[PDB]
Paper text:
In addition to determining the structure of CBM9.3, we were also able through renewed efforts to crystallize and determine the structure of the previously biochemically characterized GE15 domain of CkXyn10C-GE15A.15 Residue numbers in this section reflect the numbering as in the PDB file, where Glu22 corresponds to Glu1340 in the full-length protein sequence. We were also able to determine the 3D structure of the GE domain, which represents the first structure of a GE from a hyperthermophilic organism. As expected from previously determined structures of CE15 enzymes, the overall structure is an α/β-hydrolase fold with the active site located in a shallow pocket, and as in other studied bacterial GEs, there are no disulfide bonds. Within the active site, the catalytic serine-histidine-glutamate/aspartate triad is conserved and easily identifiable in CkGE15A and is comprised of Ser210, His348, and Asp311. Compared to previously studied GEs, one of the major differences in CkGE15A is that it lacks two inserts previously found in bacterial enzymes (Reg1 and Reg3) and has a rather different structure of the aromatic-rich Reg2, implicated in the interaction with the lignin portion of the substrate. In the structure of TtCE15A from T. turnerae, rather than a loop, Reg2 is found as a helical protrusion with several aromatic residues that could provide binding sites for complex biomass.22 In CkGE15A, Reg2 is uniquely formed by a β-hairpin, which presents several aromatic residues toward the active site (Phe120, Trp122, Trp125, and Phe127), thus possibly playing a role in substrate recognition and binding moieties such as hydrophobic lignin fragments or a xylan chain. A similarly positioned residue within the loop is not present in CkGE15A due to a sharp turn at Gly115; however, it is possible that Tyr212 could play a similar role, as it is in the same spatial area.
Author numbering: 12 to 394
Amino acid sequence: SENLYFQGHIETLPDSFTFYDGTKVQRLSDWPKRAQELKDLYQFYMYGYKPDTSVEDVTYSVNGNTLTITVKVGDKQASFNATVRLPQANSGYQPPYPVIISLGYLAGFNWQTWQFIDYSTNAVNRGYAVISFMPNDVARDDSSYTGAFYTLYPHSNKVENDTGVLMAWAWGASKILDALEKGAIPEIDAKKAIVTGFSRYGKAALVAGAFDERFAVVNPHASGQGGAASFRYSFAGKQYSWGVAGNAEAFSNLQGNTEGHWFNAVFREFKDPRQLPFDQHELIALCAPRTVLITGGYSDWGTNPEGTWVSFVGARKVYEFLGVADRIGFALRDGSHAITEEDVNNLLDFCDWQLRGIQPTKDFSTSRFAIDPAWDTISVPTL
Protein backbone atom coordinates (compact mmCIF):
# COMPACT_ATOMS: atom_id res chain seq x y z
CA SER A 1 0.00 0.00 0.00
CA GLU A 2 2.93 2.33 -0.68
CA ASN A 3 1.71 3.31 -4.18
CA LEU A 4 0.51 6.84 -3.40
CA TYR A 5 -1.81 6.92 -6.44
CA PHE A 6 -4.20 4.82 -4.34
CA GLN A 7 -3.65 6.36 -0.89
CA GLY A 8 -5.26 9.77 -1.32
CA HIS A 9 -7.84 11.22 1.06
CA ILE A 10 -9.64 14.59 0.87
CA GLU A 11 -11.00 16.55 3.86
CA THR A 12 -12.71 19.92 3.60
CA LEU A 13 -10.26 22.41 5.08
CA PRO A 14 -12.18 25.56 6.06
CA ASP A 15 -11.05 28.25 3.62
CA SER A 16 -8.98 31.06 5.13
CA PHE A 17 -9.89 33.22 2.12
CA THR A 18 -13.69 32.93 2.49
CA PHE A 19 -15.39 35.46 4.76
CA TYR A 20 -17.97 34.29 7.29
CA ASP A 21 -20.73 35.53 4.93
CA GLY A 22 -19.44 33.46 1.98
CA THR A 23 -17.82 36.30 0.04
CA LYS A 24 -14.15 36.07 -0.88
CA VAL A 25 -11.00 37.71 0.44
CA GLN A 26 -9.65 39.48 -2.65
CA ARG A 27 -7.35 42.32 -1.55
CA LEU A 28 -4.65 42.82 1.06
CA SER A 29 -7.01 45.34 2.69
CA ASP A 30 -9.52 42.49 3.21
CA TRP A 31 -7.20 40.48 5.43
CA PRO A 32 -7.50 42.40 8.76
CA LYS A 33 -11.27 41.98 8.69
CA ARG A 34 -10.97 38.26 7.94
CA ALA A 35 -8.40 37.79 10.70
CA GLN A 36 -10.76 39.38 13.24
CA GLU A 37 -13.50 36.92 12.20
CA LEU A 38 -11.12 34.00 12.76
CA LYS A 39 -10.12 35.39 16.16
CA ASP A 40 -13.79 35.62 17.13
CA LEU A 41 -14.37 32.04 15.93
CA TYR A 42 -11.39 30.64 17.83
CA GLN A 43 -12.39 32.47 21.02
CA PHE A 44 -16.05 31.45 20.92
CA TYR A 45 -15.62 27.85 19.74
CA MET A 46 -12.32 26.71 21.26
CA TYR A 47 -10.15 28.82 23.61
CA GLY A 48 -12.52 31.32 25.22
CA TYR A 49 -12.06 35.08 25.07
CA LYS A 50 -8.98 37.14 25.78
CA PRO A 51 -10.00 39.86 28.28
CA ASP A 52 -9.97 43.54 27.39
CA THR A 53 -6.36 44.62 27.98
CA SER A 54 -7.22 48.35 28.19
CA VAL A 55 -8.48 48.10 31.79
CA GLU A 56 -5.53 46.14 33.23
CA ASP A 57 -2.98 48.11 35.26
CA VAL A 58 0.40 46.35 35.06
CA THR A 59 3.19 47.12 37.57
CA TYR A 60 6.46 45.33 38.26
CA SER A 61 9.36 44.88 40.64
CA VAL A 62 12.85 43.59 39.86
CA ASN A 63 14.98 41.83 42.47
CA GLY A 64 18.16 40.19 41.24
CA ASN A 65 17.08 37.71 38.54
CA THR A 66 13.36 37.83 39.47
CA LEU A 67 10.84 40.04 37.68
CA THR A 68 7.61 40.20 39.68
CA ILE A 69 4.61 41.05 37.49
CA THR A 70 1.52 42.48 39.20
CA VAL A 71 -1.80 43.11 37.46
CA LYS A 72 -4.83 44.97 38.84
CA VAL A 73 -8.36 44.56 37.43
CA GLY A 74 -11.15 46.38 39.23
CA ASP A 75 -10.60 45.87 42.96
CA LYS A 76 -8.56 42.67 42.48
CA GLN A 77 -4.84 42.22 41.98
CA ALA A 78 -2.58 39.24 41.37
CA SER A 79 1.15 38.67 40.90
CA PHE A 80 3.52 36.10 39.47
CA ASN A 81 7.29 35.82 39.13
CA ALA A 82 9.39 35.52 35.97
CA THR A 83 13.09 34.64 35.87
CA VAL A 84 15.35 36.89 33.77
CA ARG A 85 18.69 36.01 32.18
CA LEU A 86 20.63 38.54 30.07
CA PRO A 87 23.60 38.17 27.71
CA GLN A 88 27.01 39.54 28.61
CA ALA A 89 29.20 41.75 26.42
CA ASN A 90 31.31 38.75 25.32
CA SER A 91 28.36 37.58 23.19
CA GLY A 92 29.36 40.18 20.61
CA TYR A 93 26.04 41.99 21.14
CA GLN A 94 25.21 45.17 23.07
CA PRO A 95 21.94 46.11 24.82
CA PRO A 96 19.07 46.30 24.25
CA TYR A 97 18.68 42.60 23.40
CA PRO A 98 15.88 40.62 21.77
CA VAL A 99 14.14 38.46 24.36
CA ILE A 100 12.80 34.90 24.36
CA ILE A 101 9.72 34.67 26.58
CA SER A 102 9.40 30.95 27.42
CA LEU A 103 6.27 29.34 28.86
CA GLY A 104 8.11 27.00 31.18
CA TYR A 105 11.87 26.76 31.47
CA LEU A 106 13.87 26.76 28.23
CA ALA A 107 15.31 23.40 29.22
CA GLY A 108 15.33 19.78 28.11
CA PHE A 109 14.89 16.61 30.16
CA ASN A 110 17.52 13.86 30.41
CA TRP A 111 15.64 10.55 30.62
CA GLN A 112 18.76 8.73 31.91
CA THR A 113 19.27 10.91 34.99
CA TRP A 114 15.96 12.80 35.19
CA GLN A 115 17.98 16.04 35.37
CA PHE A 116 17.22 19.08 33.26
CA ILE A 117 19.49 20.61 30.62
CA ASP A 118 19.48 24.41 30.60
CA TYR A 119 19.38 25.80 27.05
CA SER A 120 18.99 29.42 28.18
CA THR A 121 22.82 29.36 28.03
CA ASN A 122 22.72 28.78 24.26
CA ALA A 123 20.40 31.76 23.92
CA VAL A 124 22.29 34.33 25.99
CA ASN A 125 25.56 33.32 24.34
CA ARG A 126 23.97 34.28 21.01
CA GLY A 127 22.76 37.61 22.35
CA TYR A 128 19.18 36.73 23.35
CA ALA A 129 17.75 37.54 26.76
CA VAL A 130 15.58 34.78 28.23
CA ILE A 131 12.58 35.39 30.49
CA SER A 132 10.70 32.31 31.67
CA PHE A 133 7.68 31.87 33.91
CA MET A 134 5.85 28.89 35.39
CA PRO A 135 2.46 28.74 33.62
CA ASN A 136 0.73 27.07 36.60
CA ASP A 137 1.37 30.27 38.57
CA VAL A 138 -0.90 32.05 36.08
CA ALA A 139 -3.39 29.19 35.68
CA ARG A 140 -3.21 25.69 37.17
CA ASP A 141 -3.16 22.82 34.71
CA ASP A 142 -6.48 21.42 35.93
CA SER A 143 -10.17 22.28 36.32
CA SER A 144 -9.79 24.22 39.60
CA TYR A 145 -9.61 27.48 37.59
CA THR A 146 -7.14 29.01 40.03
CA GLY A 147 -4.02 31.12 39.55
CA ALA A 148 -3.18 34.75 38.91
CA PHE A 149 -5.34 34.90 35.75
CA TYR A 150 -8.44 33.50 37.44
CA THR A 151 -7.96 35.63 40.55
CA LEU A 152 -8.52 38.61 38.23
CA TYR A 153 -11.03 36.91 35.88
CA PRO A 154 -12.96 34.27 37.83
CA HIS A 155 -14.09 31.42 35.60
CA SER A 156 -17.76 30.75 34.92
CA ASN A 157 -19.79 29.23 32.11
CA LYS A 158 -20.89 32.64 30.83
CA VAL A 159 -19.34 33.13 27.40
CA GLU A 160 -17.30 36.16 28.52
CA ASN A 161 -15.96 34.33 31.59
CA ASP A 162 -15.45 30.83 30.12
CA THR A 163 -11.79 31.37 29.27
CA GLY A 164 -9.69 28.21 29.00
CA VAL A 165 -6.29 27.55 30.53
CA LEU A 166 -4.32 27.88 27.25
CA MET A 167 -5.63 31.43 26.74
CA ALA A 168 -4.75 32.12 30.39
CA TRP A 169 -1.15 30.95 29.88
CA ALA A 170 -0.89 33.09 26.73
CA TRP A 171 -2.18 36.04 28.78
CA GLY A 172 0.71 35.39 31.16
CA ALA A 173 3.26 35.77 28.35
CA SER A 174 1.53 38.99 27.27
CA LYS A 175 1.70 40.45 30.79
CA ILE A 176 5.49 40.03 30.81
CA LEU A 177 5.63 41.94 27.51
CA ASP A 178 3.43 44.65 29.11
CA ALA A 179 6.00 45.08 31.88
CA LEU A 180 8.84 45.09 29.32
CA GLU A 181 7.05 47.77 27.27
CA LYS A 182 6.95 49.83 30.47
CA GLY A 183 10.73 49.53 30.71
CA ALA A 184 10.96 46.93 33.50
CA ILE A 185 14.23 45.62 32.02
CA PRO A 186 15.89 48.44 30.06
CA GLU A 187 18.49 46.04 28.60
CA ILE A 188 15.71 44.26 26.65
CA ASP A 189 14.15 45.42 23.38
CA ALA A 190 10.39 44.85 23.72
CA LYS A 191 9.92 45.17 19.95
CA LYS A 192 12.07 42.05 19.43
CA ALA A 193 10.06 39.61 21.57
CA ILE A 194 9.92 35.88 20.80
CA VAL A 195 7.38 33.55 22.44
CA THR A 196 8.17 29.82 22.77
CA GLY A 197 6.79 26.84 24.63
CA PHE A 198 6.92 23.03 24.50
CA SER A 199 3.99 20.57 24.27
CA ARG A 200 0.99 21.93 26.23
CA TYR A 201 2.91 25.20 26.57
CA GLY A 202 3.52 25.19 22.81
CA LYS A 203 -0.23 25.24 22.18
CA ALA A 204 -0.36 28.30 24.45
CA ALA A 205 2.67 29.88 22.75
CA LEU A 206 0.78 29.69 19.44
CA VAL A 207 -2.31 31.24 21.06
CA ALA A 208 -0.13 33.98 22.52
CA GLY A 209 1.30 34.75 19.09
CA ALA A 210 -2.04 34.77 17.29
CA PHE A 211 -3.81 37.00 19.85
CA ASP A 212 -0.96 39.34 20.84
CA GLU A 213 0.36 41.16 17.75
CA ARG A 214 3.44 42.49 19.57
CA PHE A 215 5.35 39.20 19.44
CA ALA A 216 7.79 39.37 16.52
CA VAL A 217 8.49 35.59 16.49
CA VAL A 218 6.10 32.77 17.48
CA ASN A 219 7.51 29.29 18.17
CA PRO A 220 5.03 26.53 19.00
CA HIS A 221 7.34 23.63 19.79
CA ALA A 222 5.80 20.14 19.51
CA SER A 223 2.37 21.72 20.03
CA GLY A 224 0.37 18.94 18.43
CA GLN A 225 -3.42 18.72 18.50
CA GLY A 226 -5.06 21.87 19.74
CA GLY A 227 -1.88 23.67 18.59
CA ALA A 228 -0.35 23.59 15.10
CA ALA A 229 -1.48 20.09 14.04
CA SER A 230 -4.40 19.67 11.65
CA PHE A 231 -7.57 18.38 13.29
CA ARG A 232 -8.79 16.75 10.06
CA TYR A 233 -5.55 15.24 8.65
CA SER A 234 -3.65 12.56 10.54
CA PHE A 235 -1.66 9.62 9.26
CA ALA A 236 -1.57 6.78 11.83
CA GLY A 237 -0.20 3.65 10.17
CA LYS A 238 1.30 5.44 7.16
CA GLN A 239 4.70 4.10 6.13
CA TYR A 240 7.37 6.81 6.10
CA SER A 241 11.01 6.14 5.30
CA TRP A 242 11.82 6.72 9.01
CA GLY A 243 9.00 4.50 10.32
CA VAL A 244 5.34 3.60 10.49
CA ALA A 245 3.34 6.43 12.05
CA GLY A 246 1.81 5.91 15.47
CA ASN A 247 -1.47 7.44 16.63
CA ALA A 248 -2.01 11.18 16.77
CA GLU A 249 -3.74 12.43 19.90
CA ALA A 250 -7.48 11.76 19.72
CA PHE A 251 -9.91 14.70 19.57
CA SER A 252 -11.89 13.21 22.49
CA ASN A 253 -8.72 13.16 24.62
CA LEU A 254 -8.51 16.95 24.26
CA GLN A 255 -12.07 17.24 25.57
CA GLY A 256 -11.84 14.88 28.54
CA ASN A 257 -11.07 15.30 32.19
CA THR A 258 -7.27 15.38 31.82
CA GLU A 259 -7.12 18.18 29.21
CA GLY A 260 -10.58 19.73 28.69
CA HIS A 261 -9.75 22.71 30.93
CA TRP A 262 -7.39 23.92 28.18
CA PHE A 263 -10.47 24.87 26.16
CA ASN A 264 -14.00 26.15 26.79
CA ALA A 265 -17.38 24.48 27.22
CA VAL A 266 -18.42 24.91 23.57
CA PHE A 267 -15.29 23.09 22.41
CA ARG A 268 -15.96 20.17 24.74
CA GLU A 269 -19.42 19.61 23.20
CA PHE A 270 -18.28 18.84 19.64
CA LYS A 271 -18.65 15.24 18.59
CA ASP A 272 -16.21 15.39 15.68
CA PRO A 273 -13.47 17.87 14.71
CA ARG A 274 -15.06 18.20 11.26
CA GLN A 275 -17.74 20.22 13.06
CA LEU A 276 -15.20 22.95 13.91
CA PRO A 277 -15.59 26.14 11.82
CA PHE A 278 -11.79 26.22 11.28
CA ASP A 279 -8.66 24.12 11.13
CA GLN A 280 -5.24 24.96 12.41
CA HIS A 281 -3.81 26.41 9.18
CA GLU A 282 -6.01 29.37 10.16
CA LEU A 283 -4.70 29.71 13.73
CA ILE A 284 -1.12 29.74 12.39
CA ALA A 285 -2.11 32.28 9.74
CA LEU A 286 -3.36 34.58 12.51
CA CYS A 287 0.34 35.22 13.23
CA ALA A 288 0.84 36.84 9.81
CA PRO A 289 2.66 39.09 8.94
CA ARG A 290 4.77 38.38 12.00
CA THR A 291 7.09 35.40 11.96
CA VAL A 292 6.27 31.81 13.02
CA LEU A 293 8.55 28.78 13.41
CA ILE A 294 7.09 25.30 13.81
CA THR A 295 9.53 22.90 15.54
CA GLY A 296 9.20 19.33 16.79
CA GLY A 297 10.13 15.75 15.93
CA TYR A 298 9.55 13.71 12.78
CA SER A 299 8.82 10.63 14.95
CA ASP A 300 6.73 12.47 17.59
CA TRP A 301 3.57 10.70 16.49
CA GLY A 302 1.20 12.07 19.15
CA THR A 303 1.78 15.57 17.79
CA ASN A 304 0.87 14.47 14.22
CA PRO A 305 4.05 15.28 12.21
CA GLU A 306 2.54 15.39 8.72
CA GLY A 307 -0.69 17.00 9.97
CA THR A 308 1.51 19.80 11.35
CA TRP A 309 3.03 20.06 7.84
CA VAL A 310 -0.51 20.22 6.36
CA SER A 311 -1.32 23.17 8.62
CA PHE A 312 2.01 24.83 7.82
CA VAL A 313 1.49 24.59 4.05
CA GLY A 314 -2.05 25.97 4.31
CA ALA A 315 -1.03 28.78 6.65
CA ARG A 316 1.81 29.77 4.33
CA LYS A 317 -0.79 30.60 1.66
CA VAL A 318 -1.86 33.57 3.76
CA TYR A 319 1.78 34.57 4.20
CA GLU A 320 2.23 34.38 0.42
CA PHE A 321 -0.95 36.41 -0.14
CA LEU A 322 0.50 39.14 2.13
CA GLY A 323 3.84 39.04 0.28
CA VAL A 324 5.95 37.71 3.19
CA ALA A 325 6.21 33.95 2.54
CA ASP A 326 9.72 33.88 4.09
CA ARG A 327 8.31 34.69 7.53
CA ILE A 328 6.78 31.23 8.19
CA GLY A 329 9.24 28.39 8.80
CA PHE A 330 9.23 24.64 9.44
CA ALA A 331 11.90 22.67 11.30
CA LEU A 332 11.25 19.18 12.55
CA ARG A 333 14.24 16.99 13.41
CA ASP A 334 14.95 13.37 14.34
CA GLY A 335 13.34 11.87 17.38
CA SER A 336 10.29 12.34 19.51
CA HIS A 337 8.58 14.48 22.13
CA ALA A 338 11.35 16.60 23.68
CA ILE A 339 13.11 19.94 23.82
CA THR A 340 16.50 19.23 22.21
CA GLU A 341 19.57 21.40 21.69
CA GLU A 342 18.77 21.31 17.95
CA ASP A 343 15.26 22.71 18.57
CA VAL A 344 16.74 25.67 20.45
CA ASN A 345 19.52 26.22 17.90
CA ASN A 346 16.96 26.17 15.06
CA LEU A 347 14.92 28.82 16.90
CA LEU A 348 18.03 30.98 17.37
CA ASP A 349 19.01 30.56 13.71
CA PHE A 350 15.48 31.54 12.64
CA CYS A 351 15.56 34.61 14.90
CA ASP A 352 19.02 35.70 13.71
CA TRP A 353 17.62 35.59 10.17
CA GLN A 354 14.28 37.35 10.74
CA LEU A 355 15.47 39.86 13.35
CA ARG A 356 19.13 40.42 12.39
CA GLY A 357 19.31 39.63 8.67
CA ILE A 358 21.83 36.79 9.13
CA GLN A 359 21.24 34.32 6.29
CA PRO A 360 20.57 30.81 7.66
CA THR A 361 22.27 27.62 6.54
CA LYS A 362 18.97 25.69 6.89
CA ASP A 363 16.08 25.79 4.41
CA PHE A 364 13.08 26.66 6.60
CA SER A 365 10.61 26.32 3.69
CA THR A 366 10.83 22.56 2.96
CA SER A 367 10.73 19.30 4.91
CA ARG A 368 10.90 15.55 4.46
CA PHE A 369 7.19 15.54 3.51
CA ALA A 370 5.87 15.87 -0.02
CA ILE A 371 3.08 18.34 -0.71
CA ASP A 372 0.03 16.20 -1.44
CA PRO A 373 -2.56 17.63 -3.89
CA ALA A 374 -5.24 15.85 -1.84
CA TRP A 375 -4.74 18.15 1.17
CA ASP A 376 -3.06 21.15 -0.50
CA THR A 377 -6.44 22.78 -1.12
CA ILE A 378 -6.02 26.36 0.17
CA SER A 379 -5.12 28.70 -2.70
CA VAL A 380 -3.90 32.31 -2.76
CA PRO A 381 -6.49 34.67 -4.31
CA THR A 382 -5.72 35.95 -7.80
CA LEU A 383 -4.52 39.57 -7.89
